[PDB]
Ligand binder design. Structure first.
Ligand SMILES: CCCCCCCCCCCCCC(=O)OC[C@H](COP(=O)(O)OCC[N+](C)(C)C)OC(=O)CCCCCCCCCCCCC
Ligand SMILES: CCCCCCCCCCCCCC(=O)OC[C@H](COP(=O)(O)OCC[N+](C)(C)C)OC(=O)CCCCCCCCCCCCC
Ligand SMILES: CCCCCCCCCCCCCC(=O)OC[C@H](COP(=O)(O)OCC[N+](C)(C)C)OC(=O)CCCCCCCCCCCCC
Ligand SMILES: CCCCCCCCCCCCCC(=O)OC[C@H](COP(=O)(O)OCC[N+](C)(C)C)OC(=O)CCCCCCCCCCCCC
Ligand SMILES: CCCCCCCCCCCCCC(=O)OC[C@H](COP(=O)(O)OCC[N+](C)(C)C)OC(=O)CCCCCCCCCCCCC
Ligand SMILES: CCCCCCCCCCCCCC(=O)OC[C@H](COP(=O)(O)OCC[N+](C)(C)C)OC(=O)CCCCCCCCCCCCC
Ligand SMILES: CCN1CC(n2nccc2-c2cc(C(F)(F)F)ccc2Oc2ccc(S(=O)(=O)Nc3ncns3)cc2C#N)C1
Ligand SMILES: CCN1CC(n2nccc2-c2cc(C(F)(F)F)ccc2Oc2ccc(S(=O)(=O)Nc3ncns3)cc2C#N)C1
Ligand SMILES: CCN1CC(n2nccc2-c2cc(C(F)(F)F)ccc2Oc2ccc(S(=O)(=O)Nc3ncns3)cc2C#N)C1
Ligand SMILES: CCN1CC(n2nccc2-c2cc(C(F)(F)F)ccc2Oc2ccc(S(=O)(=O)Nc3ncns3)cc2C#N)C1
Lengths: 242, 242, 245, 250
């Protein structure tokens, strides 16, 4: 009896069917506009509840097989946190709408159901993991970039923030404009040149910020290149020996 | 008329002369403007018909020398699709002109004869396939980047698709702005800063979107290097034997 | 004598405690608002006074325990130059605040407070490592940086000549032309903002800016390739050493 | 008699440290005068600056005539020495040709173009000072390999440029009117400067499926570009793997 239910759960079909189910939930979410139709909203929402119930049947079948060993594997554990959030959230969203800004934000909880398309599917799972593994080597370079931003963010508010509060009022505004100056999005035409009307020697803060930022950025990417080449030459080196 | 032609087609004269015919068909396609002059349109359209005729003459000679073995080659197969699409397009466009916006959309079939420059030039052939061989390795990273775009796209409509339909109303409408924000083109001054007039904490969607997409970007570029470094080191590894 | 002090200053706890103060002084420098109110501005000013005192006390112990070693160490003198800057600044900014003179002189002079905070790139370890491993790169690309500046001159001497007459706001001065050519280099509004309105007056302006972008991008790409090949030289020239045995 | 004493004494002056370091000084000194010309600026300041430059023009002519008698046809075989002479003949022609257009006040627009000859004098700074000529030659040695990717990139621009003019040429002649116009706008779109907020979005009011031409263009160009930058790395790693190779042979 149970060996047939476990045969079906720990199956080549079952995985492919759950992948398919998530893919179709994504399609029922992809067909959402601003229009929309008071009817369409009632239509789409129910097809999602058709999914939420099937995805709770999905984890109930999968918790039946693993009993308490389900909590051990974080994959099984993630699928459970996604399922509880879909449920806790769909009822929270229905509740809010019945009695504003919160409704559209709270309605986000549905993303976990389709986010499982990086998790539940292998090949993708592999690329997500192999990419995440880069971050710790960068964590030092990342930390200095954050640390450098604080010095400049304290300076910007101090220096310009009086006449330019729209960009450098609080350290919050200051951090944002600097990141934008860093991404080089309208740094001059939009931010530095109008600053040079009030303060002609404003570039003395931004031109070096651009240089310092770009330098740290260049070294970060180069470190990933060289870290990939360090492990590549390591296997190449021992092969040569004999 | 099969004994002498078999050797003239597989000659330096025939391949160089046919490459010359393409260059001359590019120049005639270039000397087109918005102007234009109806006489200039009639003259240029006729110069093209001569080349469309000449390139048909070319493929007939190429078919009846290689007999059926012509169709084995995917390159000769392409050069054949080029002439049929050119001939079909020639009359398809003319039928519409004689009997407005569809006429422009159809007329780009003329590019087929000009696209042959990469495939026909035996060196341009090489640089193209050297770039093609890169893509299989990238396919993993792309698929993940595509899916991340979908999640961020479904979110953008749900969050800001209502009040800002010009950039986020539809899924595809949202997909476009996310690509514009990815290329970092006017992401802050033109999109995120005006979005924060309505939604003050909108930056907590776009800055985390920037990082997610840029990290994946860096890694793809880094991957193209490592993939090509396995080429330098492998021809060096076999050389280090003697 | 003084061995109990020699154990406090230059230890593990004391080393860590100074980081804690540097970090706590950053958080009070993070309370900078657009407002700000006569109360809050003076409140913040006084909190910093306390920190400046603590940091002067901090360098007093440091130079006493390592009497001759202070001058030999470069990082030990940085924390000293910062102390003498923080002290000079404190009263120099106060002098301009008391004697009501240009907020422009005050806002610029108050920028000495930053020294107390940029100590985090020094004082806390691994941060000193990263910043030093980054600074070590700067010479192994200094010729490319030098070539770039020279390339910028030649191009700025040209831009002021050609476009400077009808476009003074962007190219009227060599200082104006050094700015615009830098903006064009970062590709920010290069065409729409500068090269396109220039073509309204001088339609063959692109013949200068398209090659400028090219000449200036090639030098840039190679500067980054130089950082890679020099990093991959330390790896490659040690790889050979092991292979030899 | 010999007779050859002076032509072996003058080579000790021309092929020395002082001369070389002094000629590098003269170019730097000629740069600062060219640097101080701006917005406008009286005919006094303009004549003052013009005369300082004439002095500099003859100063480099004596320098090349010194090298002319010493190295002779051995200077001709050197490209850096040949170019130095080309600069001199340009800084002289230019000096007169610009003055001619100033005397007979016909074409004030052609004047600023011809007057650009003066840049040859300070253009020589990268080739004169060593280590700068080193890197210049090192960068110049990167472009030959790179050449085939560039040739492909150019071709991709020709096919995309004949396409842009064909489609959005009638309603938007401002950007894609002529073939040459399309080349510029597609380069702007490639460099990503206001590609959407400025060009692809307004184009979508008229032709709403216009992005189907630009998104692939932005992909294709960026794909060829990345591979070009990656090629520079592989062109550079050809040096490292070969020097290491012979060392391991023994
Ligand atoms: O640790 C330093 C990490 C990088 O570590 P990571 O390379 O991840 O692991 C190696 C360290 N190990 C073996 C001891 C775990 O990363 C760091 O460098 C941490 C940086 C610490 C400075 C924190 C600044 C916050 C200021 C408060 C506002
Ligand atoms: C890996 C990276 C992790 C590093 C995280 C560092 C976070 C920095 C925290 C310091 C800080 O005050 O930033 C948060 C503020 C938000 O405060 P707020 O002043 O409310 O700004 C929101 C309104 N705005 C954008 C229209 C001005 O300003 C921002 O939004 C900063 C975001 C810029 C990036
Ligand atoms: O849905 C697919 C859409 C076409 O539908 P639709 O959004 O109706 O048409 C685009 C025109 N627009 C933006 C003014 C509404 O197609 C699009 O317009 C989206 C095209 C942008 C996709 C680029 C993102 C892929 C990057 C992955 C790496
Ligand atoms: C060694 C000790 C040196 C003492 C230096 C004294 C000094 O210059 O500090 C001044 C503090 C008092 O100023 P403050 O706290 O601004 O007092 C309020 C003044 N009011 C009503 C005119 C705005
Ligand atoms: C590596 C590549 C080189 C990096 C270039 C960085 C761009 C520097 C631009 C710059 O700050 O100007 C250089 C100075 C300033 O002269 P000035 O005419 O005072 O310009 C002030 C800027 N303004 C008019 C827009 C308010 O003009 C000079 O006197 C020195 C030249
Ligand atoms: C023929 C041909 O190529 O045209 C040259 C074009 C200039 O076109 P032309 O119609 O001569 O002048 C247009 C000037 N405008 C915008 C002020 C009206 O000038 C251009 O080609 C525009 C420059 C774009 C360079 C893109 C080169 C491809 C990059 C490959 C790496
Ligand atoms: C005035 C309120 N009316 C709207 C709601 N309604 N209309 C159709 C279906 C539902 C609905 C029913 C249930 C039930 F009948 F089950 F009680 C639970 C939730 C329901 O509503 C939603 C269903 C799905 C989604 S979703 O597709 O966006 N998924 C989400 N996931 C996480 N947060 S929202 C959102 C809502 C809402 N509001 C009743
Ligand atoms: C105003 C109406 N005129 C269109 C036609 N005309 N005028 C000059 C040449 C031709 C023409 C002749 C033939 C025939 F000779 F067969 F009768 C076939 C097609 C013909 O028309 C074209 C010729 C070339 C091109 S092209 O240069 O754009 N090349 C193309 N390649 C692929 N698709 S279009 C387009 C058209 C059209 N329409 C009458
Ligand atoms: C209305 C005039 N008030 C300015 C001054 N004041 N208010 C509060 C504290 C102080 C102050 C006290 C001392 C004394 F302790 F002597 F009483 C010395 C200097 C003092 O002034 C400053 C102290 C710290 C900072 S800071 O926090 O910006 N840190 C800086 N570091 C370097 N340059 S500024 C700025 C000022 C000023 N002006 C009187
Ligand atoms: C009506 C003519 N006015 C210009 C002339 N003037 N004033 C000062 C120096 C000269 C001058 C003298 C000579 C002579 F001495 F021969 F008589 C030759 C050319 C001279 O003029 C120039 C000198 C230098 C430059 S430059 O600094 O731009 N250098 C250049 N280099 C290359 N092309 S221009 C431009 C001009 C002009 N016109 C008076």
């Amino acid at each position: 009896m149970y060996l047939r239910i476990t045969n079906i759960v720990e199956s080549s079909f079952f995985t492919k069917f759950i992948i398919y189910l998530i893919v179709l939930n994504m399609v029922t979410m992809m067909v959402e506009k601003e229009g929309q139709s008071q009817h369409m909203t009632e239509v789409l929402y129910w097809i999602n509840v058709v999914f939420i119930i099937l995805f709770t049947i999905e984890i109930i079948l999968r918790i039946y097989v693993h009993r308490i060993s389900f909590f051990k594997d974080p994959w099984s554990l993630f699928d459970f946190v996604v399922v509880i959030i879909s449920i806790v959230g769909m009822f929270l969203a229905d509740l809010i709408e019945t009695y504003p800004t919160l409704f559209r934000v709270i309605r986000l909880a549905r993303i976990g159901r389709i986010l499982r398309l990086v998790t539940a599917v292998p090949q993708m799972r592999k690329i997500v993991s192999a990419l995440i593994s880069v971050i710790p080597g960068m964590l030092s370079v990342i930390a200095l970039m954050t640390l450098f931003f604080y010095i400049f963010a304290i300076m910007a508010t101090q220096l310009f923030g009086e006449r330019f509060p729209e960009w450098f009022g609080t350290l919050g505004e200051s951090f944002y404009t600097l990141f934008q100056v860093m991404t080089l999005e309208s740094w001059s035409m939009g931010i530095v040149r109008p600053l040079m009307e009030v303060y002609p020697y404003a570039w003395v803060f931004f031109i070096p910020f651009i240089f310092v930022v770009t330098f740290v950025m260049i070294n970060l990417v180069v470190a990933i290149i060289v870290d990939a080449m360090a492990i590549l030459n390591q296997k190449e080196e021992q092969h040569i020996i004999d």
